[PDB]
Amino acid sequence: ATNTVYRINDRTSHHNLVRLNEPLPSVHGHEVLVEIRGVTLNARDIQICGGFYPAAAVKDNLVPCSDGAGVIAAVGDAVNDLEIGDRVIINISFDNLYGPLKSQKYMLGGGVDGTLRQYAAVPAHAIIKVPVDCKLDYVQLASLVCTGATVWNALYGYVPMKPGQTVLFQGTGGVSITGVQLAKAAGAVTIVTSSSDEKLEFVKDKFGVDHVINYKTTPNWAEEVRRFTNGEGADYVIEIGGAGTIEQSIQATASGGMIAVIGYLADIKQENMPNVPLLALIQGCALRGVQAGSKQLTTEMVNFVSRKNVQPYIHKTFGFTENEVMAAFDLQNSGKQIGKVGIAVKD
């Protein structure tokens, strides 16, 4: 019995992942062995494998990817409430069960080995049980670990969204696509921005978002957000531009609204760095640095997704052979994808 894993040691490109056959891991008494069946990628995996993840330290001989779902294949001798065959997701963190994330030491695919392998030994306390009536496949289930957890934290982990409020999503990446599908099933009005009109059309057609705005051709986007919200502005902004876009974002937000700061993909120079304390003081709105999401939160969002039959959107699902895995990573890097890229470890 073999565990086929991918590991990287030279973090200058995902093309330094090496397919290895290892012995089946034994579990410690408090662990469970997960047969991984579905995985999805994140920008984080590209940043880590390519050596531009400044948030935290990354281990040597790393198995990448935070996102995995599958079934229990073995159970340690102290473990109570998990059986072989049980269908599961792994929490993005081993240790962040509730409250704020205190480090990245135990984050899958970074501080500890991630999900791009057939088998993983993990602490049972990291396990999220997939409700029994859930009809999603394993890749869809995996999709919830990083983007689902993050979005639910931004919308429900500090001051919670109310039905009827407006959420603005920057770009058409995994955070936004996962976000629009959850927010729309929670009764939000949704707005999405993009550098591409083709993408905006696609997002509008598949997900039924209420308004689209091209931020490349229409950099005065705050003003449009205001037109579509009766002059009030958006109640939540899922902010992935960082300083480069924070001025527009602030002016697009209602007073009393929330800007969930999540990424910083946008360019900025010191000369144009906006005065954020002053802008936020004038708008009367909040900013919050969002850091994934705890197990408690993520479980609620999982329960919602199952109970209401939200069907996470998967752009393309690849197999587990080397050429397939690189084609999936390549697609994640290109920026041409809408939402999630998936990998079927089994089928």
Ligand X SMILES: NC(=O)c1ccc[n+]([C@@H]2O[C@H](COP(=O)([O-])OP(=O)(O)OC[C@H]3O[C@@H](n4cnc5c(N)ncnc54)[C@H](OP(=O)(O)O)[C@@H]3O)[C@@H](O)[C@H]2O)c1
> Minimum CB separation from its own copies for residue 161, in Å?
14
With tokens 């009766």, the residue in question is: 230
Spell out the residues 6+ positions from residue 11 whose beta carbon is closer than 8 angstroms to its own: 48, 49, 50, 51, 58, 62
- Measure the CA–CA gap between 284 and 303, rounded to whole angstroms: 34
> Minimum CB separation from ligand X for residue 237, in Å?
11
- Measure the CA–CA gap between 204 and 209, rounded to whole angstroms: 5
- Hey, what's the torsion of the CAs at 213, 215, 217, 223, to 10 degrees? 70
> Minimum CB separation from ligand X for residue 149, in Å?
8
Q: 249 or 317: whose CB is closer to its own copies?
A: 249
> Minimum CB separation from its own copies for residue 239, in Å?
7
Residue environment code for 8-41, b if the CB has 16+ CB neighbours within 10 A, otherwise e: beebeebeebeeeeeeebebeeebbbbbbbbbbb
- Measure the CA–CA gap between 210 and 187, rounded to whole angstroms: 12
- The tokens describing 329, both together, are 């990573």
> Minimum CB separation from its own copies for residue 254, in Å?
8
- The tokens describing 279, both together, are 């802008």
Q: 163 or 289: whose CB is closer to its own copies?
A: 289
Q: Which does 194 bind (CB under 5 to 8 A by kind): ligand X, its own copies, none?
A: ligand X
Q: How many residues are recorded in the chain? A: 347
Q: Which does 11 bind (CB under 5 to 8 A by kind): its own copies, ligand X, none?
A: none
> Minimum CB separation from its own copies for residue 146, in Å?
15
- The tokens describing 169, both together, are 């999503």
With tokens 């599961």, the residue in question is: 88
Q: Which does 44 bind (CB under 5 to 8 A by kind): its own copies, ligand X, none?
A: ligand X
Q: Which does 285 bind (CB under 5 to 8 A by kind): its own copies, ligand X, none?
A: its own copies
Q: 121 or 262: whose CB is closer to its own copies?
A: 262
> Minimum CB separation from ligand X for residue 176, in Å?
6
> Minimum CB separation from its own copies for residue 102, in Å?
6
- Which residues would be at the binding site for ligand X (CB under 6 A)? 42-44, 146-147, 150, 170-175, 193-196, 199, 215, 240-241, 244-245, 262-266, 290-292, 335
Q: Which of 258, 4, 310, 260 is nearest to 140 (CA)?
A: 310
Q: 18 or 52: whose CB is closer to its own copies?
A: 52
Q: Which does 196 bind (CB under 5 to 8 A by kind): ligand X, its own copies, none?
A: ligand X
Question: Would you say 247 and 282 are in contact if contact means Cβ atoms under 8 Å apart?
Answer: no
DSSP-assigned letter for residue 28: P
Please identify the residue of the shown chain whose CB is closest to the bound ligand X. Answer: 173
Question: Would you say 31 and 124 are in contact if contact means Cβ atoms under 8 Å apart?
Answer: yes
Q: 37 or 199: whose CB is closer to ligand X?
A: 199
Q: 151 or 200: whose CB is closer to its own copies?
A: 151
- Measure the CA–CA gap between 169 and 149, rounded to whole angstroms: 16
Q: Is 217 helix (H, G, I), strand (E, B) or coil?
A: coil
Q: 75 or 154: whose CB is closer to ligand X?
A: 154
Q: 75 or 312: whose CB is closer to ligand X?
A: 312
Q: Which does 146 bind (CB under 5 to 8 A by kind): its own copies, ligand X, none?
A: ligand X
- Which residues would be at the binding site for its own copies (CB under 8 A)? 54-55, 99-102, 158-159, 239, 242-243, 246, 254-256, 261-264, 268, 270-271, 273-278, 280-291
- Measure the CA–CA gap between 181 and 179, rounded to whole angstroms: 5
